[PDB]
Design an enzyme around this catalytic site. Sequence first.
Site, short mmCIF file in Angstrom:
data_model
loop_
_atom_site.label_atom_id
_atom_site.label_comp_id
_atom_site.label_asym_id
_atom_site.label_seq_id
_atom_site.Cartn_x
_atom_site.Cartn_y
_atom_site.Cartn_z
CG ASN A 139 -0.65 5.00 -13.24
OD1 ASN A 139 -1.19 3.96 -12.84
ND2 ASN A 139 -1.15 5.71 -14.24
CG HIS A 140 0.15 5.10 -6.35
ND1 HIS A 140 1.48 5.38 -6.61
CD2 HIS A 140 -0.21 5.71 -5.20
CE1 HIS A 140 1.89 6.15 -5.61
NE2 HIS A 140 0.91 6.39 -4.74
CB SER A 151 -7.12 14.03 -13.70
OG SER A 151 -8.47 14.16 -14.12
CB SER A 184 -4.88 14.66 -4.25
OG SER A 184 -5.70 14.00 -5.20
CD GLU A 222 -12.71 -4.40 -15.71
OE1 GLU A 222 -12.20 -5.34 -16.36
OE2 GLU A 222 -13.33 -4.56 -14.63
CE1 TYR A 247 -7.93 11.48 -9.18
CE2 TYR A 247 -9.55 12.67 -10.49
CZ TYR A 247 -8.45 11.83 -10.42
OH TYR A 247 -7.86 11.40 -11.57
CB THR A 283 -1.06 -0.01 1.13
OG1 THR A 283 -1.85 1.17 1.03
CG2 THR A 283 -0.45 -0.11 2.53
N1 LIG Z 1 -9.19 6.28 -16.10
C1 LIG Z 1 -9.51 7.58 -16.22
O1 LIG Z 1 -10.59 7.94 -16.67
C2 LIG Z 1 -8.52 8.62 -15.75
C3 LIG Z 1 -8.82 9.96 -15.98
C4 LIG Z 1 -7.93 10.96 -15.61
C5 LIG Z 1 -6.74 10.63 -14.99
N2 LIG Z 1 -6.45 9.34 -14.72
C6 LIG Z 1 -5.23 9.03 -13.81
O2 LIG Z 1 -4.58 7.89 -14.27
C7 LIG Z 1 -3.98 7.12 -13.20
C8 LIG Z 1 -4.39 5.67 -13.33
O3 LIG Z 1 -5.84 5.56 -13.30
P1 LIG Z 1 -6.56 4.23 -13.83
O4 LIG Z 1 -7.87 4.61 -14.40
O5 LIG Z 1 -5.63 3.42 -14.65
O6 LIG Z 1 -6.85 3.48 -12.44
P2 LIG Z 1 -7.33 2.00 -12.08
O7 LIG Z 1 -7.62 1.10 -13.22
O8 LIG Z 1 -8.45 2.07 -11.06
O9 LIG Z 1 -6.06 1.47 -11.27
C9 LIG Z 1 -5.60 2.01 -10.00
C10 LIG Z 1 -4.23 1.43 -9.70
O10 LIG Z 1 -3.77 1.89 -8.41
C11 LIG Z 1 -3.74 0.80 -7.50
N3 LIG Z 1 -4.08 1.28 -6.16
C12 LIG Z 1 -5.32 1.46 -5.61
N4 LIG Z 1 -5.30 1.82 -4.35
C13 LIG Z 1 -3.94 1.87 -4.04
C14 LIG Z 1 -3.24 2.11 -2.84
N5 LIG Z 1 -3.84 2.34 -1.66
N6 LIG Z 1 -1.89 2.04 -2.87
C15 LIG Z 1 -1.29 1.72 -4.02
N7 LIG Z 1 -1.84 1.46 -5.21
C16 LIG Z 1 -3.18 1.55 -5.16
C17 LIG Z 1 -4.61 -0.29 -8.15
O11 LIG Z 1 -4.35 -1.65 -7.73
P3 LIG Z 1 -4.44 -2.20 -6.23
O12 LIG Z 1 -5.85 -1.91 -5.71
O13 LIG Z 1 -4.20 -3.70 -6.43
O14 LIG Z 1 -3.40 -1.61 -5.38
C18 LIG Z 1 -4.21 -0.10 -9.61
O15 LIG Z 1 -2.91 -0.59 -9.93
C19 LIG Z 1 -4.44 7.80 -11.92
O16 LIG Z 1 -3.42 8.65 -11.41
C20 LIG Z 1 -5.69 8.55 -12.40
O17 LIG Z 1 -5.94 9.71 -11.62
C21 LIG Z 1 -7.32 8.31 -15.12
C1 LIG Z 2 -9.33 8.18 -12.34
C2 LIG Z 2 -10.75 8.38 -11.82
C3 LIG Z 2 -10.76 9.19 -10.53
O1 LIG Z 2 -11.25 7.07 -11.51
C4 LIG Z 2 -11.66 9.02 -12.88
C5 LIG Z 2 -12.84 8.46 -13.31
C6 LIG Z 2 -13.67 9.11 -14.24
C7 LIG Z 2 -13.35 10.33 -14.71
N1 LIG Z 2 -12.18 10.93 -14.29
C8 LIG Z 2 -11.60 12.14 -14.60
C9 LIG Z 2 -12.24 13.24 -15.41
C10 LIG Z 2 -13.60 13.69 -14.89
C11 LIG Z 2 -14.74 13.61 -15.68
C12 LIG Z 2 -15.97 14.05 -15.22
C13 LIG Z 2 -16.07 14.55 -13.94
CL1 LIG Z 2 -17.61 15.16 -13.37
C14 LIG Z 2 -14.96 14.63 -13.12
C15 LIG Z 2 -13.73 14.21 -13.60
C16 LIG Z 2 -11.30 14.28 -16.00
C17 LIG Z 2 -11.93 13.29 -16.90
N2 LIG Z 2 -10.43 12.22 -13.99
N3 LIG Z 2 -10.24 11.06 -13.25
C18 LIG Z 2 -11.30 10.30 -13.42
#
Ligand SMILES: NC(=O)c1ccc[n+]([C@@H]2O[C@H](COP(=O)([O-])OP(=O)(O)OC[C@H]3O[C@@H](n4cnc5c(N)ncnc54)[C@H](OP(=O)(O)O)[C@@H]3O)[C@@H](O)[C@H]2O)c1
Ligand SMILES: CC(C)(O)c1cccn2c(C3(c4ccc(Cl)cc4)CC3)nnc12
EC number: 1.1.1.146
Lengths: 265, 262
Positions: A95-96, A146, A162, A197, A159, A68
């Site tokens: 990235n986490h 993000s 941070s 997902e 969120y 963690t």
């Molecule tokens: N997907 C989007 O729409 C989106 C949008 C904007 C920005 N981002 C940014 O992209 C990055 C990755 O997002 P993602 O969508 O790929 O996420 P995701 O599929 O939910 O994966 C989250 C990752 O972090 C781990 N994690 C969760 N809790 C943790 C903890 N307490 N300590 C350490 N690791 C932890 C998860 O696995 P474990 O639970 O096994 O630890 C997994 O490896 C993030 O920084 C997110 O803010 C994503």
């Molecule tokens: C990674 C995470 C937290 O699971 C996640 C999920 C879904 C959207 N995310 C977004 C945006 C967004 C879109 C709409 C609203 Cl209202 C808020 C924020 C910027 C696209 N940033 N991170 C995320």
Amino acid sequence: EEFRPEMLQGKKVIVTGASKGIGREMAYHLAKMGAHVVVTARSKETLQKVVSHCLELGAASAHYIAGTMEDMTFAEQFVAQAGKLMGGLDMLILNHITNTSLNLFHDDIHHVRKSMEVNFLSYVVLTVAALPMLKQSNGSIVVVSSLAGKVAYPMVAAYSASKFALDGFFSSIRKEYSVSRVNVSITLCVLGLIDTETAMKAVSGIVHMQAAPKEECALEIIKGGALRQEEVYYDSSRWTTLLIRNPCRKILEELYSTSYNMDRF
Amino acid sequence: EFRPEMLQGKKVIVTGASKGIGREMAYHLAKMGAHVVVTARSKETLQKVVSHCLELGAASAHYIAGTMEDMTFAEQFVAQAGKLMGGLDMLILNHITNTSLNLFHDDIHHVRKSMEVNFLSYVVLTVAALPMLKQSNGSIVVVSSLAGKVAYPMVAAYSASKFALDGFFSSIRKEYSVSRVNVSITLCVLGLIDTETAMKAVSGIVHMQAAPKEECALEIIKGGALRQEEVYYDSSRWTTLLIRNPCRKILEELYSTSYNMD
Ligand SMILES: NC(=O)c1ccc[n+]([C@@H]2O[C@H](COP(=O)([O-])OP(=O)(O)OC[C@H]3O[C@@H](n4cnc5c(N)ncnc54)[C@H](OP(=O)(O)O)[C@@H]3O)[C@@H](O)[C@H]2O)c1
Ligand SMILES: CC(C)(O)c1cccn2c(C3(c4ccc(Cl)cc4)CC3)nnc12
Ligand SMILES: NC(=O)c1ccc[n+]([C@@H]2O[C@H](COP(=O)([O-])OP(=O)(O)OC[C@H]3O[C@@H](n4cnc5c(N)ncnc54)[C@H](OP(=O)(O)O)[C@@H]3O)[C@@H](O)[C@H]2O)c1
Ligand SMILES: CC(C)(O)c1cccn2c(C3(c4ccc(Cl)cc4)CC3)nnc12
């Protein structure tokens, strides 16, 4: 200025939150490029599956250390362990994130504090631990953020806080590294909605917008890190690409850069 | 247009009001005939402010000394301040942990303490103040920096918490708009101010024009009273010009169509 997969060949890379989503996709792209990888997350089983597939794709070496990122002692020790496994470090991909749902803010201070600790403070702890190795290799720090870390959105208050914090901190130390001639690049990745997902489940019935593919996303992050780009922008809309950049911010920063006497530091 | 009678009889909290901009705000509010409850750690410094605020013509003036490192104190202070005034119309969040201009190396304690005092206590103070502000259709005033909008070296931890202040309070402002909570949020983006602590901090490190603290304190109050989203205050003509992000508001407006908030 033009990217090549051979740029990542034999490079020693850390990928946090690499058991799923964008993090796993990055591990896979790095593997294909023939890089050395050390992946982390909490789940041992999920990380085992990524290492196995990373070796299959052609990684120079693939390892995992489960734990963690709520534990600052783990965060610090993980970096000393990962550099030992690879014989150094060239790239640190942060990235986490703490699991977060779309909700209005009312009184969840525990979620505000946990978001700051996992999404921001562990990144600082991981950077402090990784800097001696990155100074040696003239390496890269890659900070996954993000659009909610550049503009305001409802339902993500903790969120967004941070994510905004990462920009403030890492953009400040980038200016410090420039003057103190530390040859470590910092890439801030500003991402829109990605088809992971967790994100698709989070927006279901609340947010209605186009989701960008996670495979391509992961590559664009690696691309910017390798090209030592200050910021990487990745989103579905054409309009976002067009208006997300802040030209006036960089102009203001350039004008002030002349006034700061630091020859005492 | 701002009229000082807007603050007459208003129930206002000023954090970090023992000195600098915070004390200047207490003094302006006093002259305007507002009810004030000031906070800081030093009891003696607070006493001198309360005395002088009654002399300036405050409707009432009180102080509650304590550290904003203590989230229990932060929560209880609001409740106590509201009891003293018979409610709350304005919450001015101004306090910061003592910070010096230095390069970042390994001070994680200062990164964590900056987040706790400069940002988390503001959230704790808001959660405690919201029921009273909802009742009065009040205002939250968040004192920030240019360092909370653009990047500067030697202030990594301080910049992080000011940036976090933007992300958090700009997000809850959008939430309050849709959930029809009539509580305004004013983010104050400030340049170099001629406060004792700031002038000592920049001494021999950075010299530039310092804006007067008296006027600064007034521009914050004006902003809050006019329920403005953001207040910009700096000496340089080039700062006021380039500090605004027009494209951010445009982007936020385009995304507002992609979500349902019912
Ligand atoms: N997907 C989007 O729409 C989106 C949008 C904007 C920005 N981002 C940014 O992209 C990055 C990755 O997002 P993602 O969508 O790929 O996420 P995701 O599929 O939910 O994966 C989250 C990752 O972090 C781990 N994690 C969760 N809790 C943790 C903890 N307490 N300590 C350490 N690791 C932890 C998860 O696995 P474990 O639970 O096994 O630890 C997994 O490896 C993030 O920084 C997110 O803010 C994503
Ligand atoms: C990674 C995470 C937290 O699971 C996640 C999920 C879904 C959207 N995310 C977004 C945006 C967004 C879109 C709409 C609203 Cl209202 C808020 C924020 C910027 C696209 N940033 N991170 C995320
Ligand atoms: N002045 C500038 O150059 C400048 C520039 C940009 C932004 N700003 C912003 O303006 C605001 C006020 O700044 P200022 O220059 O007027 O500051 P200041 O003179 O240094 O005053 C800080 C105030 O906060 C109190 N405080 C300190 N630590 C505290 C703690 N742990 N708990 C509670 N209260 C605490 C101090 O009193 P005690 O020590 O008695 O507790 C004092 O009343 C801040 O938000 C600052 O970021 C100022
Ligand atoms: C309140 C505090 C911490 O005492 C303070 C003191 C002095 C200046 N401050 C600033 C600015 C700035 C200017 C130059 C640099 Cl290198 C860093 C930051 C934006 C003006 N923000 N806060 C402060």
